[PDB]
């Protein structure tokens, strides 16, 4: 009831519990956090139950408590409170509660398909599960400001609860006060940076595989109601044409022997979009933000990507990453144009869609390729990559060939899931004239309920106080050394499993022998 | 009695 | 409730999901449904199945070296948490799994039989890791993996959650194949505030993120747990090793120098609950250094605690308490005070390793040992000479120690009647401002005016100042001006046709720095 949570909120004050050591990998668990429509600024309120974890002091400005949107370290984006004393609330309208427990985000760009995607849904999918309770039940706050956007119908099958904006926030009252709300997004989905500080490209250390990928997309399809072989082409229609279209779509089914279907954003329903897409065995469009639809591709599909003159596919990979995660299973093919008689420059369109020195005008279209820089507003690259291109069929069909040898698609595939060994088990040692060396071990212990084509072990042999070692690579579950041994010497022996040449299991506990 | 490390891997 | 072949369905078909935060094991806690446990192997079970999610999904990585801390020691060898990978079919030649009916809290305890490693490493982690997750502190039970016993505090333990926790032998027990449909694993680092020497010489954590506030948040849950609620110094007493040799005379002394009530407590001799209750109403706490000096943190706001530390022990190599004492939020006043009179020590160099014997080392060593005045920086665990120097006993000089605390202590120890205010930072100033004038070839004047952060509206602040930080749109290099006023006129080395970057923040009371705005751009 109503006194209860105003007695609660003024006696206790707001409680803050939060993940991680720094704000560009921290999620936070509030009770009782308010937040000013007038000021837009969430509040902590000090009470005699305040816990603020971490407790940052004036580091909370250094820059910030956490980031808002996935897009890590951006100055526009992060998230932080100013602070009150509890007792200030009689100086204030009284509160508004939200009852829900809510998820407070901000979308980096609703109105980018490939952004909605691996910035926000991804990470909402996975942060909701990341604790109990809030995949089923927190409504989504979208606190960024920007409007609904275009793609506000996929925001909404991310919950069961309509997804608020901060301007909706506003309209409900002056002091809003979350009973419950956790406050940020993981990273541990994406896979591309947009280049603020060093030119775009992967991201350096990628913690997500297809498998999650493919998971999320299962159920955004059942979501959708989406459970005769073709190749898929994702046409644009705006700008960035292919302008052979036709000629395209002939050339291709000729080839590969199969029906081509175009495709696009505005003419079709999403569901229907990703119907097409999640059967489809080639899937052929212009870099853009359209192909991130090929996570919805079936494994062993394949993703050829048509990039404009001057625009090199080794510096613009959002979606090379994506098709050749571990687990996505997809081939990827990148074609560029090397003929400036196929380009289609557009200088007179505004600066939006890439009024300059005539001087620098000039240096712009003697570039044989975009040179690398940093976001966002590059007009070199703008002018680029927003050129209409006719498509060199003959040089297009010859590099998917290098790639795709025969009929593309899952035709005649399987794939299995890559297990890593355990730790081999009660490893022992046996020294010894001539100083001698001999080890053993059992198989891990997940082995005995495995079936693996090349089972070898790691074997490292390291001198007492040396940072070196001599590695071995051994089939038998055992070895006698006779190369380095020398008398009277502590040898410490590591042992570990590899399947299949790659899978590289742990190492044991350290074996200590000395001669 | 304080959990010690166990040897370091070397780092060669 | 469990309706046992469901259960077992869905994890044969599904198998097992992992969401984990941090992009490093040392900074990672996993929620996990559908994990599995051998305990004829002792190892976790990751089931691969239709439904499977892993992440991080790490590959190799998995083991460089691990998942995550199952401790709160940071990075600590033989404390990783890990599992082992098999198809979810693999079930089939498996014994039928006992399902956990707890959702589960997963962690390795450090250092059991210590209370100070109890406290610091387990409880407050324990007590806020279960905070972090909605429904965790009143449903979980907790699963110590370590493979200790109960150890002498393990009703410390049954404090923390209404539930019996659960030892790793206790789990061959319940079965030979275990599967936790929810359980959640790791330990957040946050309140820990001490790292105990495994890389560098043990001391402070280097960015400590907890405060006084939400130690005593956690000390006032465990004082209602313990059923606890005329000044009086508390003298805090060992009575196996590390002893003050004079206590009777440090007992009479401290009394009269104070004009105080004087009273002494152990661990050994005393229910914890009592030693709570003594350490919750004292004025001053005196104790050698040694773990029963974590109580500290139920010492009231404004007592002082002071460490002694036995020849040779440098009270700024071995902080843990000084650290906790002097914690921002914490309020307490802290002394240390050092034998340096080689008279008032007692060697025991026979006592087994454990106990600071040396006599297993060789006579050189034990020769320099005798003669060290000061023990050497070391890393952790088992430095003889330290373990030699702080197992001494140790005869108090009184007059110095006196002397010492009265340098801190001005006259009455303790909270006489302070009241603690919590101190809160500025907000951004709001609608910043700039025009621009000019005079002549070199000579331009910049005029800035900003409005009050949005939270001074609703408090009082004895003193309010605003630093603003000039620089030209070109260069590398910035002016900060400490003003007043909402308002400035910049004159100096101001030029026409130029762009500057502005930057201003609030600052309460000299200390508390606020954000800074966003940049104001001003070109004259
Ligand atoms: C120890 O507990 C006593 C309670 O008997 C405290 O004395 C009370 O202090 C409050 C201030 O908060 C006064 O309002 C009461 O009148 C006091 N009661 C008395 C004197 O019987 C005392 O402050 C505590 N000492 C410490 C160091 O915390
Ligand atoms: O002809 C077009 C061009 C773009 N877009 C969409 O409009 C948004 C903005 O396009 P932009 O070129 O800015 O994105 P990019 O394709 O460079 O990622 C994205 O969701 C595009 O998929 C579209 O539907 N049709
Ligand atoms: O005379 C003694 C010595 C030790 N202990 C307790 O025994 C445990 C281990 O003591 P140790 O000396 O190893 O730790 P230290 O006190 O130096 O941290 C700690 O919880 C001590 O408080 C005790 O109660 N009385
Ligand atoms: C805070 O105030 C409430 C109500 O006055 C009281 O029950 C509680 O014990 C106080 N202290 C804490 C630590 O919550
Ligand atoms: C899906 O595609 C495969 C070949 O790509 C085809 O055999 C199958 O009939 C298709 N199903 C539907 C519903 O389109
Ligand atoms: C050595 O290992 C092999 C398996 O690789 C095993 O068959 C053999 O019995 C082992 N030999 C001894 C002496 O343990
Ligand atoms: C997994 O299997 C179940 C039952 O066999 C099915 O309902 C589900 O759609 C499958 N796929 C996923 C991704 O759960
Ligand atoms: C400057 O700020 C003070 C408050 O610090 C205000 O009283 C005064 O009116 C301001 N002057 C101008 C010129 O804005
Ligand atoms: C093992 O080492 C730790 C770190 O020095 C101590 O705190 C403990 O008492 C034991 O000596």
Redesign the pocket.
């Known amino acids: 009831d109503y006194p209860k949570a105003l007695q609660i909120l003024t006696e206790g004050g707001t409680h803050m519990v939060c993940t991680g050591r720094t704000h560009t990998d921290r999620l936070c668990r509030f009770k009782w956090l308010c937040y000013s429509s007038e000021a837009e600024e969430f509040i902590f309120f000090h009470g005699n139950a305040s816990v603020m974890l971490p407790s940052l002091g004036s580091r909370r400005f250094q820059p910030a408590l956490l980031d808002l949107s996935t897009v890590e370290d951006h100055n526009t984006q992060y998230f932080n409170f100013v602070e009150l004393p509890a007792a200030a609330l009689r100086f204030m309208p009284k509160p508004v509660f939200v009852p829900d427990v809510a998820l407070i985000a901000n979308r980096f760009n609703p109105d980018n398909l490939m952004h909605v995607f691996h910035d926000d849904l991804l990470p909402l999918f996975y942060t909701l599960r990341q604790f109990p309770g809030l995949a089923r039940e927190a409504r989504l706050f979208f606190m960024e400001g920007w409007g609904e956007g275009a793609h506000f119908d996929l925001y909404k099958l991310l919950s069961p609860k309509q997804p608020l904006l901060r301007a909706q926030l506003k309209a409900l009252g002056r002091l809003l006060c979350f009973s419950h709300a956790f406050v940020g997004l993981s990273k541990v989905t994406t896979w591309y940076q947009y280049g603020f500080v060093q030119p775009q490209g992967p991201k350096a250390n990628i913690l997500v595989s297809g498998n999650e990928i493919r998971q999320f997309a299962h159920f955004l399809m059942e979501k959708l109601n989406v459970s005769?072989?073709?190749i898929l082409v994702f046409s644009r229609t705006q700008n960035r044409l292919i302008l052979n279209e036709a000629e395209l779509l002939l050339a291709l089914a000729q080839e590969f022997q199969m029906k081509t279907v175009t495709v696009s954003l505005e003419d079709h329903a999403f569901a229907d979009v990703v119907r097409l897409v999640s059967?489809a065995?080639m899937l052929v469009s212009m870099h853009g933000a359209q192909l991130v639809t090929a996570l919805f591709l079936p494994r062993g599909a394949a993703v050829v990507e048509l990039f404009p003159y001057a625009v090199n596919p080794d510096h613009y990979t959002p979606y090379k990453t994506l098709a050749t995660l571990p687990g996505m299973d997809l081939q990827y093919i990148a074609w560029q144009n090397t003929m400036p008689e196929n380009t289609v420059t557009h200088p007179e369109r505004p600066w939006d869609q890439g009024h300059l020195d005539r001087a620098e005008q000039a240096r712009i279209l003697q570039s044989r390729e975009v040179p690398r820089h940093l976001c966002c507003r590059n007009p070199e690259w703008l002018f680029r990559i927003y050129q209409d291109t006719k498509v060199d069929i003959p040089s297009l069909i010859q590099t998917i060939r290098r790639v795709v040898k025969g009929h593309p698609?899952?035709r005649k595939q399987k794939w299995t899931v890559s297990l890593y060994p355990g730790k081999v088990r009660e490893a022992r040692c046996q020294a010894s004239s001539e100083a001698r060396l001999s080890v053993s071990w059992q198989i891990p212990w997940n082995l005995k309920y495995l079936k693996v084509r090349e089972v070898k072990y790691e074997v490292w042999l390291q001198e007492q106080g040396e940072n070196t070692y001599v590695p071995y690579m051994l089939a038998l579950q055992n070895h006698t050394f006779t190369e380095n041994i020398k008398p009277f010497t502590t040898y410490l022996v590591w042992i570990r499993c590899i399947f299949n040449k790659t899978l590289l299991g742990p190492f044991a506990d350290v074996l200590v022998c000395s001669t | 009695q304080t959990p010690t490390l166990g040897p370091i891997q070397p780092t060669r």
Do not use: D, L, V
Request: glycine residues 14%; proline residues 14%.
């Open positions: 005769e072989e073709y059967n065995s698609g899952p």
